[PDB]
């Protein structure tokens, strides 16, 4: 189910989160 | 003895418009010459006006300005605006049909606003009410009012019976030129302005440039006959047409999302009053209801 | 924000905005502190100033927030412009007929309106504005909580449309936008009515997206934002055409994608 993060191009890696 | 003034305002506006399937229906008058058979689903009078447009749509013919029968959303808005102000309407349909862009006069080099804009730059002008769009070039010449309905573009492709339809215009299959289906702009107006605005679209202009039709119905029938599967127009008309003909489904994103507007000429007294009236009608919620009772149900 | 100690001018990614701060409460110590601030409207302001070549020394509003015709005198940015004290009122300003009657506006660039913030605690939940429930909610289940704030935009429209709903909604009044969200999460609040854009932004980047708006992208009082301008100011045409060109060339869409993007939202 989990997805591979596409580096900084991934928006989730673009926006920091407390759990990341 | 009292000194007169150069002011009468003439209270005799004569509006122009454009035929539109979901917005301004057109049909020839009955054999009696007076329109009849007015009834809504919920039960209410169907107000229809006696508009005067040339029945010879083809270019070059014994132009017959026969009195047709017409109605629709813009007509209702015009009726409400006439009610909130105090004047009389002598609405007649467009003579040419094109939405109107900037084009140099043939056999010359001077630039003139052809199509719809010519009337507003001529005596007719008055208070055009139609699904006109707001653009920088259009706003440079004439003045507008606040929009009454926001609509993007939402490109429509004929639904298939395995689906890899383009998601966004920048899709490499769509962005790069292709030869299976060719993009259609319909009459080259209200979209051609944006297409010339962006050079990235000019990279793929050729397909849309050399295959756009001259009328909305022609492109619709080409899509329905599988001549092409590509069509880019206003969001509202596309949504209504997809709904009523529940065989094709519109799939697309919201790009170049600008509302419609009410046209006007140079400097006329009605501008402030009509802008205040349209804003108040929007705040009153009356716009929501008149949208509801007219266009929210079509087949599916 | 505040100027960082290292090379104490500001961060190289925003603009200094002077502001008025009162030391404590009783003391009216108006040390006009120098700080630099960013966001959304300031980006458009910078872009516009680049293409219209005008300087600016902008300052925050001092007394009150937003604007209201309280005792025939307006406070906030409206009070400033209505008094010819400060041209331009760039900010999250909603277009209103009374506001338009008092102070001129420009054409909108970002659309928004009235939205309903009701979600699932654990088929749309309500999907109705003039619905059966929220038109006479006393004799239908325990009464629901309302999210509303004095001196706003939505509450005035609701009151002048049907005060009975406003009459009940006066029971629950919040202080801050985060206070209403916290109360809703804690269970003290159930429904929130506010501007669509801000609610959408808050729900997009919500921690875990436990809350979803009442309607699937549906609005009731569609009216975009705008910038207030002094009546008859010789700036209307230039700025209007400039931002029309901006929306035509897709800069607004790019800025919205870079900024007005949620955490999960469509990623489901």
CB contact under 8 A, B135 and C100: no
C223 touches chain B (CB under 8 A): yes
Contact B283 C221 (CB under 8 A): yes
Question: Distance (Å, rounded) from C-alpha B66 to C-alpha B63?
Answer: 9
Chain A nearest C-alpha distance from C203 (Å):
15
CA B199 to chain CA centroid, nearest Å: 26
Show residues of chain A in contact with C263, CB under 8 Å: 12, 15, 17
* C-alpha distance from B229 to closest chain C C-alpha (Å): 25
d(CA C268, CA C262): 12
Which residues are paired to C68 by β-bridges?
C75
Q: If 0-12 CB within 10 Å is exposed, 13-18 middle and 19+ buried, where does residue B23 land?
A: buried
State yes or no: B179 annotated in a binding site: no
Whether the CB-CB separation of B53 and B92 falls below 8 Å is answered with yes
Mutate which of C248, C252, C253, C255 to test chain B, going by most B C-beta atoms within 10 A?
C248
- Whether B133 has a binding-site annotation, put simply, is yes
Report DSSP state, residue B296. S
- The Cβ-side half-sphere exposure at A16, using a 13 Å CA radius, reads 1
Q: What is the 3-state secondary structure (H, E, C) of chain C?
A: CCCCCCCCCCCCCCEECECCCECCCCCCCECCCCCEECCCHHHHHHHHHHHHCCCCCCECCCCCCCEEEECCEEEEHHHHHHCCCCCCCCCCEECCHHHHHHCEECCCCCCCCEEEECCCCCCCCCCCCCCCHHHCCCCCCCCCCCCCCCCCCHHHHHHHHCHHHHHHHCCCCCCCHHHHHHHHHHCCCCCEEEEHHHHHHHHHCCCCCCCCCCCCCCCCCCCCEECEECCCCCCHHHHHHHHHHHHHHCHHHHHHHHHCCCCCCCCC
Cβ burial of C208 (10 Å; 0-12, 13-18, 19+) is: exposed
Rounded to whole angstroms, the Cα distance separating C83 from C41 reads 23
End-to-end alpha-carbon separation of chain B, Å? 69
- Nearest-Cα residue of chain A relative to residue C263: A12
Task: Select from B135, B257, B276 the Cβ nearest to the Cβ of C97.
Answer: B276
Q: How many CB pairs under 8 A join B and C?
A: 53
- The answer for B11, left when phi > 0, alpha when psi is -120 to 50, beta otherwise, is left
A abuts B (3+ Cβ pairs < 8 Å): no
Residues C81 and A14: their CA atoms lie apart, in Å, by: 39
For testing the chain A interface, which of C206, C258, C263, C268 should be mutated: the one with the most A CBs within 10 Å? C263
Could you identify the residue written with the tokens 């003139």? B112
C259: nearest CA partner in chain A: A15
Give the C-alpha separation, C182 to B74, whole Å. Answer: 45
Binding partners of A (≥3 Cβ pairs within 8 A): C
Chain C window 192-221: which residues touch A at a Cβ cutoff of 8 Å?
Answer: 205, 207
Give B-chain residues touching C111 at CB under 8 angstroms. Answer: 150, 257, 259
Is B138 marked as binding a ligand?
yes
| Closest CA–CA distance from residue C248 to any residue of chain B (Å) | 7
Chains sharing 3 or more CB pairs under 8 A with chain B? C
Resolution of this deposited model, Å: 4.0
Q: Please say whether the beta carbons of B49 and B161 come within 8 A.
A: no
Instruction: Inspect the interface and report whether the beta carbons of C261 and A11 lie closer than 8 Å.
Output: yes
Residues B267 and B169 sit within 8 Å (Cβ to Cβ): no
Alpha helices in B112-157 (DSSP H): 116-120, 136-141
Say how far apart CA C44 and CA C38 lie, in whole Å: 11
Structure determination method: cryo-EM
- The DSSP secondary-structure symbol of B295 reads S
List of E strands, B92-160: 92-93, 102-104, 111-113, 129-133, 150-151
Fill in the DSSP letter of residue B29. P
Number of neighbouring beta carbons within 10 Å of residue C152: 18
CB B204, CB B260: distance < 8 Å: no
Tokens of C200: 């959408």
Residue C264 near chain A (CB below 8 Å): no
Q: Is C41 on the interface with B (CB under 8 A)?
A: no
Q: How far is A7 from chain C (nearest CA, A)?
A: 16
C249/B198 Cβ within 8 A: yes
Beta-carbon separation of C205 and A11 below 8 A: no
């Amino acid at each position: 189910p989990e997805e591979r993060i596409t580096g900084i191009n991934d928006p989730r890696l673009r926006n920091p989160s407390d759990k990341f | 003895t009292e000194k007169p003034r150069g002011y009468q305002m003439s209270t005799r506006l004569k509006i122009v418009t454009i035929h539109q399937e979901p917005f301004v229906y057109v049909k020839p008058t009955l054999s009696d010459g007076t329109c009849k058979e007015e009834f809504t689903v919920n039960g209410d009078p169907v107000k229809k006006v006696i508009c005067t447009g040339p029945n010879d749509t083809s270019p070059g013919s014994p132009r017959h300005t026969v009195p047709q029968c017409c109605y629709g959303f813009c007509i209702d808005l015009l009726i409400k605006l006439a009610r909130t102000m105090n004047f009389t309407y002598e609405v007649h349909l467009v003579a040419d049909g094109k939405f109107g862009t900037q084009e140099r006069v043939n056999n010359s080099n001077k630039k003139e606003w052809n199509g719809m804009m010519g009337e507003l730059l001529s005596g007719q002008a008055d208070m055009i009410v139609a699904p006109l769009t707001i653009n920088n070039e259009r706003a440079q010449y004439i003045e507008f009012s606040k929009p009454f309905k926001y609509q993007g573009l939402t490109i429509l492709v004929k639904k298939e019976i395995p689906e890899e339809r383009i998601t966004g215009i920048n899709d490499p299959r769509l962005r790069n030129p292709s030869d299976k289906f060719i993009y259609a702009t319909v009459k080259q107006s209200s979209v051609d302005i944006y297409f010339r605005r962006q050079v990235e679209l000019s990279t793929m202009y050729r397909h849309m440039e050399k295959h756009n039709y001259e009328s909305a119905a022609e492109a619709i029938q080409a899509v329905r006959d599988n001549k092409l599967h590509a069509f880019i127009w206003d969001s509202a008309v596309l949504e209504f047409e997809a709904s009523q003909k529940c065989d094709l489904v519109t799939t697309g994103e919201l790009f170049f999302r600008s509302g419609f507007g009410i046209g006007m000429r140079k400097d006329s007294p009605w501008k402030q009053n009509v802008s205040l009236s349209i804003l108040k009608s929007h705040e009153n919620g009356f716009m929501e209801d008149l949208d509801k009772t007219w266009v929210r149900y079509q087949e599916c | 924000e505040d100027i960082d100690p290292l090379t104490e001018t500001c961060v190289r990614n925003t603009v200094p905005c002077r502001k008025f701060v009162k030391i404590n409460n009783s003391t009216n110590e108006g040390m006009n502190v120098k700080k630099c601030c960013k966001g959304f409207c300031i980006d458009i302001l910078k872009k516009l100033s680049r293409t219209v070549k005008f300087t600016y020394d902008l300052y925050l509003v001092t007394n009150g927030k937003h604007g209201k015709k309280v005792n025939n005198v307006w406070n906030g940015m409206i009070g400033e412009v209505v008094y010819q004290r400060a041209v331009m009122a760039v900010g999250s300003l909603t277009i209103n007929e009374e506001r338009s009657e008092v102070v001129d506006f420009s054409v909108p660039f970002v659309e928004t309106g009235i939205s309903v913030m009701v979600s699932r605690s654990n088929v749309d939940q309500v999907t109705g504005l003039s619905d059966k429930k929220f038109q006479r909610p006393h004799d239908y289940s325990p009464p629901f909580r309302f999210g509303t704030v004095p001196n706003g935009s939505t509450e005035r429209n609701i009151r002048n449309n049907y005060p009975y709903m406003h009459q009940y909604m006066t029971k629950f009044n919040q202080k801050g936008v985060e206070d209403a969200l916290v109360s809703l999460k804690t269970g003290k609040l159930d429904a929130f009515i506010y501007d669509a854009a801000v609610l959408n932004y808050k729900a997009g980047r919500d921690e875990g997206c436990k809350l979803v708006t009442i309607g699937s992208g549906y609005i009731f009082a569609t009216t975009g934002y705008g910038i207030a301008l002094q009546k008859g100011s010789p700036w209307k045409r230039q700025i209007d055409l400039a931002l029309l060109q901006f929306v035509g060339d897709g800069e607004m869409e790019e800025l919205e994608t870079l900024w007005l993007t949620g955490i999960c939202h469509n990623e489901k």
